[PDB]
């Protein structure tokens, strides 16, 4: 199976951590 | 229970080696051990160089000490042997005769594993 589902959660988690770090 | 002490002694003269064996045996008796037999496997060159107590040893005499001691007596004896400068190496192990070797029927041939994959036509 492709990792398309995992990639979407990968980007959401990465942006969430940067957002948390930023503020 | 019954133990075997693989004792390797520094190559010394007969009076010095005889004193060392008696002194080592007395340590077991002072710790409740009941010495069974004292064996002499001879003296041969050590397979590898052993350093102990700032001494370089190239030859050593082999002896085996068989004794009956409680479980708590094993730990104390190991500490004793380390401080002895005339002992090249001392290890306490179970006596191999205490363990009973189970009788072996032979060798059973292992059949090739089957039904590991489906019989579908790939």
């Amino acid at each position: 199976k492709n990792v398309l589902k995992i990639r979407r959660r990968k980007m959401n988690h990465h942006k969430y951590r940067k957002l948390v770090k930023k503020t | 229970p019954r133990y075997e002490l693989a004792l390797i002694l520094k190559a010394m003269q007969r009076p010095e080696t005889a004193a060392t064996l008696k002194r080592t045996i007395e340590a077991l008796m002072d710790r409740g051990a009941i010495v069974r037999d004292l064996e002499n496997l001879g003296e041969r060159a050590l397979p590898y160089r052993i350093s102990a107590h700032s001494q370089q040893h190239n030859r050593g005499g082999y002896f085996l000490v068989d004794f009956y001691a409680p479980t708590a007596a094993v730990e104390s004896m190991v500490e004793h042997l380390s401080r002895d400068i005339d002992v090249i190496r001392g290890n306490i192990v179970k006596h191999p005769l205490t363990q009973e070797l189970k009788e072996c029927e032979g060798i059973v041939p292992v059949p090739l594993a089957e039904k590991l994959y489906s019989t579908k036509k790939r």
């Binding site: - | 050593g60 090249i88 060798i107």
Partner: protein, 97 residues
């Protein structure tokens, strides 16, 4: 009825189960000459059971005995004892060919 019908039996021609060379014999870590027969004469590496031909039980026994002997000053580690280089050859391995 008929007396020639086959009967139920175990195989009478069944050969006895094969045994390793060390079957029924004790293996001791102080028995260096026996132990050296199962290590390479150049590297001292412990041969596999495909070379020694031993069974599963004795292969474990030899491996445990060799490791105990090496740390207790009975068996050399990097090489095989030269005094035991003339023992009978029991390992199915050839280097020069």
């Amino acid at each position: 009825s008929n007396e020639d019908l086959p009967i139920s039996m175990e195989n009478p021609y069944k050969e006895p189960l094969k045994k390793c060379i060390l079957c029924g014999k004790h293996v001791d870590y102080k028995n260096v000459q026996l132990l050296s027969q199962f290590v390479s004469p150049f590297t001292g590496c412990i041969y596999g059971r495909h070379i020694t031909g031993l069974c599963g039980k004795k292969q474990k026994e030899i491996t445990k005995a060799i490791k105990r002997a090496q740390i207790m000053g009975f068996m050399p580690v990097t090489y095989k004892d030269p005094a035991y280089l003339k023992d009978p050859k029991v390992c199915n391995i050839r280097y020069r060919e």
